[PDB]
Ligand binder design. Structure first.
Ligand SMILES: COc1ccc2c(=O)n(C)c3c(C)nc(-c4ccccc4Cl)n3c2c1
Ligand SMILES: [Mg+2]
Ligand SMILES: [Zn+2]
Length: 313
């Protein structure tokens, strides 16, 4: 129990900041996650033997795709760590335990293709899960890894606490289905503005947790410009692979997914920042004021994309 993880001084300081980049050294990512669990949750939340075995089985079940990979998993968990650390007293012990694990697991076994491509392909998962196809798969994969011998990091919870944390993780993971974010955010916007938002109302907490999951999931738009810009290439490498597979089914893909229409990328990012990211971090900042640095970083990156269009880069 007296074994802390400790990071080098530069990481020890920068990890606390929303805009931290976890770096190109893969073998440090498990250590970074465990550090974040210890500071966010406690050195007791989990038996280190089981947590380490859980982390390595999760890593194994992320594939070698350009964006939806183990690095995304750890990045999204770090943004959740930054939110939880800046909002100390607003979250239960069970929520802090659940949300870091949900973030690490949220895209388990992703192949780099959207729910739409699975449906048009007629992939068997599209028959098993009619909506939120990949997200219901990611939750299924999370439960499977939890049930491997030696992997049940929640085994020391009471029966009811166990049902509650698995229910936090399921809603958290389903909420990363971007098609569900638009309605979730409108509802939170109305509740905030009419004054009826109530964090002791579980249905409202669920909604606020869903928005946090979206905010963490999108956190590549909230880094320093060079990280944001170089991550956008990984994102587009999957989009264009999906675009190619669409053309193989005899369907012209949307221009965002068409590698012939790379010119339209900067305008595509404008649309995405204005339609999705800016509104997401605005409502989040309204509900949880200390998450303002994510909105400020996102606006900065919006401005960097405007500069790309004006030929200034
Ligand atoms: C409608 O789906 C889009 C379109 C464009 C983007 C995009 O441009 N960015 C930056 C993005 C970022 C940073 N995470 C995502 C994303 C979120 C959930 C699921 C899959 C992805 Cl890929 N997206 C996007 C998603
Ligand atoms: Mg996902
Ligand atoms: Zn994701």
């Amino acid at each position: 129990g007296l074994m802390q993880f400790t990071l080098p001084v530069r990481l020890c300081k920068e990890i606390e900041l929303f805009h931290f980049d976890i770096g190109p050294f893969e073998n440090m990512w498990p250590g970074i996650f465990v550090y974040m669990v210890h500071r966010s949750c406690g050195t007791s939340c989990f038996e280190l033997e089981k947590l380490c075995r859980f982390i390595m089985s999760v890593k194994k079940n992320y594939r070698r795709v350009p964006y939806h990979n183990w690095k995304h998993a750890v990045t999204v968990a770090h943004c959740m760590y930054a939110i939880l650390q800046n909002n100390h007293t607003l979250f239960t012990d069970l929520e802090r335990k659940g949300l870091l694990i949900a973030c690490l697991c949220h895209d388990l076994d992703h192949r780099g293709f959207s729910n739409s491509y699975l449906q048009k392909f007629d992939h068997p998962l599209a028959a098993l899960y009619s909506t939120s196809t990949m997200e219901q798969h990611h939750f299924s994969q999370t439960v499977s890894i939890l049930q491997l011998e030696g992997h049940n990091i929640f085994s020391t919870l009471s029966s009811s606490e166990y049902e509650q944390v698995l229910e936090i993780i399921r809603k958290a993971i389903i909420a990363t289905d971007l098609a569900l974010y638009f309605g979730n955010r409108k509802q939170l916007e109305e509740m905030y503005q009419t004054g009826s938002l109530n964090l002791n109302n579980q249905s409202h907490r669920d909604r606020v947790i869903g928005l946090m999951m979206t905010a963490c999931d999108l956190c590549s738009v909230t880094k320093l410009w060079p990280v944001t810009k170089l991550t956008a290439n990984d994102i587009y490498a999957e989009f264009w692979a999906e675009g190619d597979e669409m053309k193989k089914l005899g369907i012209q893909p949307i221009p965002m997914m068409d590698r012939d229409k790379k010119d339209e990328v900067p305008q595509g990012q404008l649309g995405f920042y204005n339609a999705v990211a800016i509104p997401c971090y605005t409502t989040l900042t309204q509900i949880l004021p200390p998450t303002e640095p994510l909105l400020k970083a996102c606006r900065d990156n919006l401005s960097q994309w405007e500069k790309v269009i004006r030929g200034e880069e």
